[PDB]
Amino acid sequence: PQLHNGLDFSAKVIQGSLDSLPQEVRKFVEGNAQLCQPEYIHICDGSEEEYGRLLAHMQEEGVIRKLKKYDNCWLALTDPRDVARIESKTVIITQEQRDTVPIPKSGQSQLGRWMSEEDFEKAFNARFPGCMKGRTMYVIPFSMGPLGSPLAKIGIELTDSPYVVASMRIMTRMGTSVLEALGDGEFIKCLHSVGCPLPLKKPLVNNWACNPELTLIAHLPDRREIISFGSGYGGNSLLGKKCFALRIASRLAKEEGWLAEHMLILGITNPEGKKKYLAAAFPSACGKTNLAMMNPTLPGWKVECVGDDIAWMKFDAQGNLRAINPENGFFGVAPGTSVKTNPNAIKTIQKNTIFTNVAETSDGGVYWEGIDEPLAPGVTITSWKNKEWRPQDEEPCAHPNSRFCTPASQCPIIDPAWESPEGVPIEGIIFGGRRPAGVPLVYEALSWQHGVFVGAAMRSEAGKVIMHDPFAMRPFFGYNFGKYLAHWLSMAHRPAAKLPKIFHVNWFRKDKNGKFLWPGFGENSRVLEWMFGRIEGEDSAKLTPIGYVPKEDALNLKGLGDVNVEELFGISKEFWEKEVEEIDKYLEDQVNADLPYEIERELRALKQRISQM
């Protein structure tokens, strides 16, 4: 109803129908149309035609370029002000701050950023009214997880960015079938705007609409809403990627008895024809995507990829920890990707892939630091800043946070169960970090409780600073980290739960000259072999103050040699005394009153074991 003509947006719909939408979806779309004032509303169908025509359109407006060397590949170059997630502008809204972050004992919380409901309403009002003027509001119905999976969750993202629509088609399952499946069910409300209403009030840089000054990425778990303004980039704009997949989902998981985690999922098969699934949480630049798509050097071993970033996991009625990859593609950091580091990634990204902030070669190909392959004489490079570039220039040819966005179905080693609705049974959980000193190649937690402590104690070289990144979730906690620790610990008391073995890895231990003690890459399959045996109950471990390590001769080093196993697995009293002190100080300050008894107990236990060496 209306007394005039400004509430019903039916006449502005250029694809689909408001009438055909479920009631709450229409209310969401129409209410935000009233607010944002788009010129048109396009209800996405997810069809190849829609996708193809939108890409062609972006190409005409100078927003993307076709990469002619490859099959249906594209390149976007951004405003240099808009190149990454911005933590300081990423907030969670709850009635009480304590529900979002623990109240630290002495310092500022680094476990999240809380914003009051009142501060957010003011921020919202100063950003969204009229923000889509002159632009199309695209309505993206998407599923996080295989369609109809008991573990899947549905979202609807509204955006004024065609770049976002195209990337969301790759990264999620989107389109009409999602709407039809949703019906009158619940969904996560996702609202995004680049914040550049037309006519433009500020200069457009590199044909990339953004509003750096007003950039704000907000999460409202109680309202089931994600609201993001001012950035068109990655984790800020593709609202499934981190906002939904980790922040909202972890809070939903807390409520519902499951886990939403920053973990790859892989399937590994041994020479005896046995297959196991493992999950792994690593901080940035620790070889996460490399492990997920690893090409094992050990004969008769196979690794297959379920996911490279996010895992949604739930203990079923039988006690198995069943995990799905809630994503539909890989949004990988481009620099450092080579045939040596990730041959399978190379194979994936040469078709139907969108690249962002990488360099472009004169023959329409892609280039970045660490690509590790020469260009034929003649082939020149345009940097990510649209300038001529030479391999002896001062600045990198690709932004360090540049990306490929590629369909998961294209990975040559994608797991056959990667979209099974039931999920895959997780038998091991691997934590990791880049530690040049002190931390052995691999160890195994003494118990579930010790394992949760190991996750909580995670640290990694940011290098000349060792920073904390518990569970690799520091930028992504949807709620109080103390309560998250409690939630994890509670899994041990769940009837019939089969708790996976927990391991910690360090590929990056160096000698006193600064050279890596472990060859890494495909040789990491040797570490995975040891884990596989341990899960099977193999008597291949030796007790140390930090947990179990491989026995002498347990680790398969055939084909290697001579590897300094003594240094690689060396455990120093002095190092670990300091290590446990830093963990203690961190947990006391950052978790404080919300630190569970059992985590404090594990800290005490580790202290004691170190004291006795």
Q: Does the protein bind Na ion through residue 58 (CB under 5 A)?
A: no
Which listed range, 55-63, 97-105, 243-251, 306-314, lies at the site for Mn ion (CB under 5 A)? 306-314
Contacts of 149 (CB under 8 A, 6+ apart): 324, 421, 422, 423
417 is in an annotated binding site: no
**Closer Cβ to Mn ion, 309 or 602, answer by number:** 309
Which listed range, 104-112, 203-211, 337-345, 357-365, lies at the site for Na ion (CB under 5 A)? 203-211
Q: How far is the CB of 89 from Mn ion (least distance, A)?
A: 18
Please identify the residue of the shown chain whose CB is closest to the bound Mn ion. Answer: 309
Q: How far is the CB of 62 from Na ion (least distance, A)?
A: 7
Size of the site for Mn ion (CB under 5 A): 1
Q: How far is the CB of 78 from Na ion (least distance, A)?
A: 6
405 included as an active-site residue? no
Of 15, 116, 176, 206, the residue at the interface with Na ion (CB under 5 A) is 206
Q: Does the protein bind Na ion through residue 404 (CB under 5 A)?
A: no
> Looking at 44, 286, 397, 405, which residue is catalytic?
286
Q: Which of residues 210-269 bind Mn ion (CB under 5 A)?
A: none
- The secondary structure of 546-559 as a DSSP string is TEEEEPTTTS--TT
Cα–Cα distance for residue pair 524/528, rounded to 1 Å: 7
Cα–Cα distance for residue pair 610/605, rounded to 1 Å: 9
Name which of Na ion, Mn ion, none residue 269 binds, using a CB cut-off of 5 to 8 Å depending on partner kind: none
Q: Does the protein bind Na ion through residue 208 (CB under 5 A)?
A: yes
Which listed range, 1-9, 43-51, 207-215, 550-558, lies at the site for Na ion (CB under 5 A)? 207-215
Closest CA to 556 of 529, 586, 593: 529
201 is in an annotated binding site: no
Q: What stretches of 208-274 adopt beta strand conformation (E)?
A: 216-220, 225-229, 259-261, 264-269
Is there a cis peptide before residue 391, judged by omega within 30 degrees of 0? no
553 is in an annotated binding site: no
Is residue 246 within 8 A of residue 473, CB to CB? The reply is: yes
Cα–Cα distance for residue pair 279/426, rounded to 1 Å: 7
586 is in an annotated binding site: no
**Closer Cβ to Na ion, 293 or 366, answer by number:** 366
Cα–Cα distance for residue pair 65/59, rounded to 1 Å: 6
Q: Which phi and psi (to 5°) does residue 521 adopt?
A: 50, -130
**Closer Cβ to Mn ion, 162 or 307, answer by number:** 307
Q: How far is the CB of 77 from Na ion (least distance, A)?
A: 4
Q: Within 10 A of 557 (CB to CB), how many other CB atoms are there?
A: 13
Name which of Na ion, Mn ion, none residue 208 binds, using a CB cut-off of 5 to 8 Å depending on partner kind: Na ion
Closest CA to 23 of 186, 176, 166, 260: 186
Token pair listed for 55:
């890409």
3-state helix vs strand vs coil in the chain, percent to 5? 30, 25, 45
**Closer Cβ to Mn ion, 516 or 597, answer by number:** 597
Cα–Cα distance for residue pair 390/388, rounded to 1 Å: 7
Token match 């149309």: residue? 33
Name which of Mn ion, Na ion, none residue 77 binds, using a CB cut-off of 5 to 8 Å depending on partner kind: Na ion
Chain-centroid distance of CA 221 in Å reads 19
Name which of Na ion, Mn ion, none residue 97 binds, using a CB cut-off of 5 to 8 Å depending on partner kind: none
Contacts of 89 (CB under 8 A, 6+ apart): 215, 216, 217, 230
**Closer Cβ to Na ion, 58 or 610, answer by number:** 58
Give the CA radius of gyration of the chain: 24
Q: Does the protein bind Mn ion through residue 309 (CB under 5 A)?
A: yes
Site string for Mn ion, 149-168 (x = CB under 5 A): --------------------
Look at residue 440 and give its three-state secondary structure: coil
**Closer Cβ to Na ion, 232 or 433, answer by number:** 232
Annotated binding site for substrate: 85, 233-235, 284, 401-403
Annotated binding site: 85, 233-235, 242, 262, 284-290, 309, 401-403, 434, 521-524
Annotated binding site for Mn(2+): 242, 262, 309
Instruction: Give the active site residues.
Output: 286
Q: Enumerate binding residues for Mn ion (CB under 5 A).
A: 309
Q: Enumerate binding residues for Na ion (CB under 5 A).
A: 77, 206-208
